Structures are given as structure tokens and as C-alpha cells.
Design a protein around this ligand. Sequence first.
Ligand code: PLP
Ligand code: PLP
Ligand code: HCI
Ligand code: HCI
Lengths: 368, 367
Amino acid sequence: MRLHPRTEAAKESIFPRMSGLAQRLGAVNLGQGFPSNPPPPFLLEAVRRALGRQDQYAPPAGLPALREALAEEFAVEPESVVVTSGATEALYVLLQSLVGPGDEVVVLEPFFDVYLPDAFLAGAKARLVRLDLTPEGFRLDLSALEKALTPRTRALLLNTPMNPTGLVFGERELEAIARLARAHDLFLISDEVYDELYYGERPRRLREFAPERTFTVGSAGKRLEATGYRVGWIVGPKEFMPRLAGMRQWTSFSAPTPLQAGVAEALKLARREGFYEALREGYRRRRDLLAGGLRAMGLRVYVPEGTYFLMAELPGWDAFRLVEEARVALIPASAFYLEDPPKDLFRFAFCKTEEELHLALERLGRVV
Amino acid sequence: MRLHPRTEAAKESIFPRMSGLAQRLGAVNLGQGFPSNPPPPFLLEAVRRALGRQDQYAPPAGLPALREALAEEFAVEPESVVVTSGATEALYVLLQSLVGPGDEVVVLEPFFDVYLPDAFLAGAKARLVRLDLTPEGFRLDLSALEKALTPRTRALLLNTPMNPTGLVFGERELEAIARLARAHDLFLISDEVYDELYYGERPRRLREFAPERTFTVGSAGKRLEATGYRVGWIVGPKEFMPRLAGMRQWTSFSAPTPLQAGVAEALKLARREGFYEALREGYRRRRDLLAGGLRAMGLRVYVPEGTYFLMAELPGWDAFRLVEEARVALIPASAFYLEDPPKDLFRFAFCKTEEELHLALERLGRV
Ligand SMILES: *Cc1c(COP(=O)(O)O)cnc(C)c1O
Ligand SMILES: *Cc1c(COP(=O)(O)O)cnc(C)c1O
Ligand SMILES: O=C(O)CCc1ccccc1
Ligand SMILES: O=C(O)CCc1ccccc1
């Protein structure tokens, strides 16, 4: 007896592994992305209110109230919204529903942890388009993007705000991508879990340029500082949504009911109490704190436009040596690149307390 | 542009569909199985204490406290327990991990909604083995089981206490199954979400006769009257567990943290406070209530030994036809069989209040 060859993709992710390593070593954890603080009180109270009354199965597509709350934010009808058990499931069910053997999916490099494994589990082939890393920062070359499209290309997987670059795609880029999508009749998968976490002008969404072929992915955990609630969603053309709900039905059936209920109220309260605005400000403050502290050490730092991650170069170091000698956990570039990753490039998560960030700067400082 | 052909399986499930229909028609819902009452106080309290403390990502394999609480109940180490987002995910990840193109999987019929679609999405073929429906009740034909085995069979999927039959596999039968699996070197997938809901003698587990090849599946939702919490588990040989944690990692990454934390404490309290016994006692009454009630109407009724489901025959009746005229929702046998399903057979769910049951009997009575 033996497991199916498919399970070769079932390797423990470097993200939770680093987290365990960090707890064991007593190191400041600036690797895997999850807030050090608890979620806002209005969300906790909304969930408490749901416990005891909404504990049983919810429809696969989602609790009616959550679908309506999301529909209002996205200006679509409830039937074009499907609630999944985290954006993680949304992404898995989408690749599973859009590509298969013989199909190709374009993925930008550096990429998010689940893209390639999901592509592989769908039996599809992924074609990577590495973004250019200049002294100014990461930059997308649309020529290189177009040069990657082929007769078998069925979908394009985009992520903005982008993890780990912190890049936010501008109007001209989305327009250009929407244009290529239409010209080759491609499906557009847009991972926008950090859609409310940007530091500049509010970005425009890819779905505005190509609504008939775009699937927008969101996450309550990345919206409301509650990564462990496992509530996410897909907003896309309604004609395809019933199928997607059909697919997530077999993976986990439905998302946690009381959490879906609490999030529904929370999404509305957040919009009217200026929560996202205050959150962005709290994060910008910490982004600058980290960036400035690393600059002062004489390090090369690429200031992000979104998400709570930033990348920097620490010459002559490797993640594991750092976590043990400096007692600071970071995620190495090799985690986001398939082959030949940039030398000495690390990702920092700054969704931590200011104290934790200062502690990390002090420790990295001594070990220069 | 069109969706990949694999989406053929993405058909809306009849169970939540009938619940939506029962709600619109103001009908008593005895179809999809989910309690009318809320979960026990000690579970609600445990979740409340976790809110604000344990809200971020838990490890894919599960929160240490839950894995350990589960390991204690099963008399195994934590490394052989993996926490899934409901038993539904356990089943999907399992088939995705054990079978693929060219492999076959044996499934007993009547089956649970999730079995065939999961087999199909893994790229394997499912060979069905129908149980015999006698005047007494359902029964497995060990000969028929063995007959269905081929050189391509990689696993067998059992469900006990069985849904929808309410059948509880006896000691002798589990042993026979254990030998066949061992002889043919097959994997055994045992769906035991209703392992604490039985009405007779404490049932034995399949993993006791073949611990080396058995993966046992459980559900906090079916153990603790909280179906919407989405916390399930897989208990199996440690040699394979890391790979299973690796697979669910890509499907939903990890189960809801505060719910896991709450379930961890609740599982321990349940044992100590005799929650399961009281639960069995409460479901037995309701079982006998619905059963006797349908008898008074002179209907054919098969009493279950487990689960909160029971099957009966309603001559010349259609499910949707019934939900409109009688305003009582049930699930037709067509949902549990692939072809030529028994005539006039429906599944009833008695995990409702006595009120709802009596109401369902009345409306049914005048029909
Ligand atoms: C965190 C994250 C996800 C997954 O979100 P969940 O809701 O936690 O499953 C998906 N994509 C990106 C880019 C993320 O940062
Ligand atoms: C309810 C049920 C499941 C699914 O359990 P979840 O924990 O709700 O996902 C699986 N198998 C059987 C036989 C069930 O009755
Ligand atoms: O750290 C991350 O980039 C975000 C959290 C995460 C990591 C890996 C899988 C799912 C989510
Ligand atoms: O009613 C059922 O038998 C149990 C609940 C269920 C049904 C279908 C898919 C997942 C769960």
C-alpha cells in the first residue's frame, strides 16, 4: 500500500513551519502573516451574539446575510457571491474549476504559497513571469507578460495588493491586463485579500476593466485581523458562481456559521465606523517604523504600497541561521521563487506590535 | 471560455436545496440532518473564552490542544491525528490522497452525498456494492462485498453508524472486512461521525481489527450538536498523517481556531459529565416516537441502531410533491442510490424537538 503520487505536493508549508521554529527558539516572529493583536471588539461581539442561535449548517453558497453584505460592498447581486472557508479554499476551488491537464495558467513571480500547488493539483501547468527587481523596486513588464501567453493559456492569476512585493497595480496595468485577457479570451483570477490595506490612493479593481471574466477573491481574516476564522469569498460573473458553490460543497461543504454571521454584521459596521481607514493608518505607521529602522542599518529596503509585508536585503544570511543567531524569524526569498531566487532577499511581516518590531530591529542590529 | 469539464460534479446538493425549499414553503424540515436545539452550554462557554485570545491561524494539522484531546479519546499519539474543516474535508482529502486514475474504490450503497463526487474528483472509479433490503431491515452480504474486489481496488469506504440506514456494523462483520482489506492490501476509510450516537451496545471500531490500514473520520458537529462549526478529524497510522496534513493545507489551510479551541475543552468535558449518555437517551425517545407514530399509520418502518435518521416507505409519493401538499420535507431514496432505487423509500431526520415531530406526524397523518 502507498499514497497516490499526487501527494508529492503535500509538503509542510514553510510559513507555519517557521512559526513553530520561532516559538521553539524564542525568536520574534516576523515571518508568517498574522496579527499579534486580537480582532476589533465589534467583530468579537457580533460573533458572541451568533453563538447559541446560528450554530448549524449554512447553505454552501453562504449565509444569506453575508452574501448580501458583500454584494452591497461590491455593488453586485447576492447570487454573484460565494462564501468559502477562507480565500485559501476560494483559490483552490477556482483553479480546480478553471484549468486541467493540457491547460496553462500564468502566475507572477514572486508568488503566494498556494498558487503552484493548486495549479499542480488541478493537473494544469503553470507558466511563471518573474517581475523585474530594480534598485527602485519590483516592476511588471507587460511585454514579458504577453510573451508568456500561448494557445493553451486558460487563466491568469493576479494578486493585488501583492504578497510579498507590496506592489499595487495601477490603472494602466489593470487596463492592459484586461485587454490581453479579452484578446485571448482568458479567465482572470484576482487575489485581493489585502484590498483594504494600501498606503496610497485607493486602487481601482481589475473587475472594473473586465467584469465578464474576472473572479475577485477576498478574506475576512485579512480584512478584520482574524486570520483563523476561515471565511472568504469569490465575487465573479453570476453565470459561473453556481458551479463554484457546487465545488466548495465537496471540499468543506460550508463555512463556519457563527463566524459567517459575525462577519456579516462586522463588514457593515467596519464601513460606517471608519475602521479600514484607521487600520491603514496604524499599518502605515509600522511600515515606516520598520523601513526606517532597516534603512538606518544600511540595508536595501523596498517600501511596499500595500499589504503588511515588506522586502529587504540582508547580505550573507539565511533564514535558519538568522532565526537561531539573531532570534528573529523571516521568510527567505526562495519561498516565493521557483528557481534561482534573488540573493539575500527576505520578507518581513509588520503586522506586529511596535514593541516586537523594535525588538527585532535591536536584535538584527547587533548581529548587523 | 467555459469551466473545466471536471465541474460536472459541481451539482447543487439536494440536502441544502430541500432545506431552502422547506423554508420557503413553511414546511417541517425532516430532510437535511441538523439539530433544532443549540449546542451544549459548556461548548458555547469554551468558545466564548477563546474569542479574542485564539483568533489567528492555527497549524494545518490542528491546534495542539485539540490533537491531544482527540489522541486521548482514541488511545493514540497526537501525530496520528489531523484536524480538518469538518468531516467533509476529511473525506475529500482522503480520497484525493489514496486513489487516482486507474484505481477503484468500493462504496456501499445507499451512500452518503459526498462519496461519489469525491471519488470522481480524484479521478478514480467507484464500484458500488448495494446492501440488501429485507422485511427485517438492511443487511450486508459479505459475499457480494468480496465479489466486487478487483486488481485495481485500492480502498474500501465504510460508514458506521451508517447514514441513511441507521445500521451499526457488528463485531463479526468488521472482522471479515478487516481480513479482506488485509489480504488484498487495501486502505480502509471509516466514516464514524455518529460514533457516540447508537441505541444498542457500545459498538466496536474498525481500526481495532486493522489499525495499520484504517483511517477513522470524526466530526465535532455531529458529536456536539454544532454542525456549522466545521471541525472534523482523521485518526490514522502516523506514517501517512503528515501527508494528509499537507493536503488539507491547500484546501482550507486550517480549521477555525476559536472553534477548535472550544471543541478541545468540550470533548473532555463531555466525557467527564456524561453528556453522550444523556444525548443517546434523548435521541432514543425521539426515535421511538417517530417510529411508533409512523407505525400507527400502518407504514413500513425500519428502526435504526444508530444516527438520528430512519427510513420508511410512503407508497406512490414524490418528495417535492409531498413538501407542497403535506408541508413536510423528506429526502427520497433517489439521493442515496445511483440507479433503480427502492420504490417509495424516504429518509427521516428526528434530530428535531418533540413539537416538530408531532407536527410532522399530524400533517403526514391526513395523507
Ligand atoms: C492570507 C492570504 C490568502 C489566504 O487567506 P485565507 O482567508 O486566510 O485563507 C490568500 N492570498 C494571499 C495573497 C494572502 O496573503
Ligand atoms: C454529517 C456527515 C458528514 C459530514 O460531517 P461534517 O463535520 O459536517 O463536515 C460526513 N459523513 C456522514 C455520514 C455524515 O452524516
Ligand atoms: O504569510 C503569508 O503570506 C500569509 C498567510 C498564509 C501563508 C501560507 C498559506 C496561507 C496563508
Ligand atoms: O443530512 C445529512 O445526511 C447530513 C448533513 C450533510 C448532508 C450533505 C452534505 C453534507 C452534510
